[PDB]
């Protein structure tokens, strides 16, 4: 068959303790780390099921998982039965829309992933989110991962993604355009697209380039 596997995000230790005891009572696989076997992401939300954007949130959508509210856990406890978590699926986030229903979109749109036919190179550096995690995100959304600017397949459409904050001693993010004929955009492009599960126009996110 197939087994329920949850991870949590936005929870405090004491809250985690609740989900742990909860997962123990009901025999639900609980883990530290999101993988392909992961079925549900349990998000801390407000009473309307809006959450903060965390890596686990992005990855839970990218993978088309059930991103449900931590209110499911508390409410199931309160009624001594496990409630249907579909009734608690996360509706939105404090950034992209309080009701954009990105989780539902990705869940129903696995056949038409948002990054089909796109080659993305995550041109480092980055912070608060490891380059391989950003890379896995795009892939899960149907993107093709290019390690090097040279590795761009010529003939698909290419996109270089950077986080200009991370650039310590460089304005070098304006030089990228030189070393390859491709659009350059901030990480917020990837993120905004994944949360809404809709591929954003690049115009807003483009980084000025020097020829």
């Amino acid at each position: 068959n197939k087994r329920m596997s949850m991870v949590v995000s936005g929870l405090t230790p004491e809250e985690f303790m609740l989900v742990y005891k909860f997962a123990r009572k009901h025999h639900i696989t609980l883990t530290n780390l999101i993988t392909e076997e992961t079925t549900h992401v349990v998000m801390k939300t407000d009473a309307e099921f809006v959450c903060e954007r965390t890596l686990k949130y992005f990855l839970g959508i990218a993978g088309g998982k059930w991103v449900v509210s931590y209110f499911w856990v508390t409410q199931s406890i309160k009624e001594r039965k496990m409630l249907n978590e579909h009734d608690f699926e996360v509706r939105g986030d404090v950034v992209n829309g309080r009701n954009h229903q990105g989780p539902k979109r990705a869940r129903e749109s696995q056949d038409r992933k948002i990054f089909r036919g796109l080659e993305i190179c995550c041109y480092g550096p980055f912070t608060n989110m490891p380059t391989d995690q950003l890379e896995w995100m795009v892939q899960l959304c149907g993107a093709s991962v290019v390690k090097e600017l040279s590795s761009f397949t010529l003939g698909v459409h290419p996109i270089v993604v950077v986080q200009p904050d991370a650039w310590t001693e460089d304005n070098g993010f304006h030089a990228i355009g030189q070393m390859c004929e491709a659009p350059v955009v901030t990480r917020k492009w990837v993120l905004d697209s994944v949360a809404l599960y809709q591929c954003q126009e690049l115009d807003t996110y483009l980084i000025p380039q020097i020829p």
Binding site: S9, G10, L11, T12, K44, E52, R53, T54, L55, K56, F58, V94, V95, N128, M129, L191
Partner: peptide
């Protein structure tokens, strides 16, 4: 939580 947020 300690997990990084993106806003």
């Amino acid at each position: 939580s300690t997990s990084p947020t993106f806003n």
